[PDB]
């Protein structure tokens, strides 16, 4: 999720009646005829096209050759000039909407500490941390959300909960 | 064992979605820009990275140079702050940063001497000096912390300090 949009771009203005095949060969084509490919091979994995609303997503196989295929905003494809850009829900700083719980009584397991985050909406990560020498947790975890405009609701309704004998603190884990 | 864990650190706080190589090429440049390599070639031969934890474990091709690299706690990398410790399982030779304790009232027992040093973490060595014949004390006492780290908190907390009408002396014992 945090790469995962880091590795997909919004097409924007196709041709009309353009396959997701033809608009691959189109943007590999391209990549290699730039010198913008990190390696052999295709950098563009799949493209998922809307015919009715005329845009698509690219999806490439490294984050770094994603933001070098930026450079082809307004390039011609079929007479047509493409509209290029980062999909919404792209995060130029990674890592800036994963949380910190802290506090969560030391008995709670993965799934029972999940259940407390994912009323909130589904998580694109998680883990609690656990001594390894005993398994036992330290009472700390992290996770960040699917979406990453819910963090903020979750910081509010989460942060110094009282959760039985303990307090959450619930916070941007930096 | 007493000699395991010499050339490897634990680094936490690394950056989302930093790869081994580029975490191995910063420490390595930083090594050489920071004047802390000892000889031609790279000190740093692998980094570790655990994705789902976020921490590295860095290994290093001598001692002196990961004990040189532990300066480097707290050095930003892509916005992080990172956090640099040895091992768990690394432990310094016994007595080696044993603690002199000068400056005791001489009617407090061994748990009340005990108090004043345990405010600053645990110990894994204490003893205070009596009078084997009566039991009574001398005023004087040794201890260890179980963290190495905490040896120059005690110090700084603890030397020079006024305890009674007396003046405490805390210092390394050698």
Known sequence: ??????????????????????MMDFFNAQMRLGGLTQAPGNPVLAVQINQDKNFAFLEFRSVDET?????????????QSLKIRRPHDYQPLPGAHKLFIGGLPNYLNDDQVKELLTSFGPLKAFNLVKDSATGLSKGYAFCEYVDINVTDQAIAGLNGMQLGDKKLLVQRAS
Chains 1, 2 share one sequence.
């Open 67 to 79: 933001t070098q295929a930026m450079a082809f905003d307004g390039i011609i494809f079929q007479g």
């Open 1 to 22: 999720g945090p790469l995962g949009s880091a590795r997909r771009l919004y097409v924007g203005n196709i041709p009309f009646g353009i396959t997701e095949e033809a």
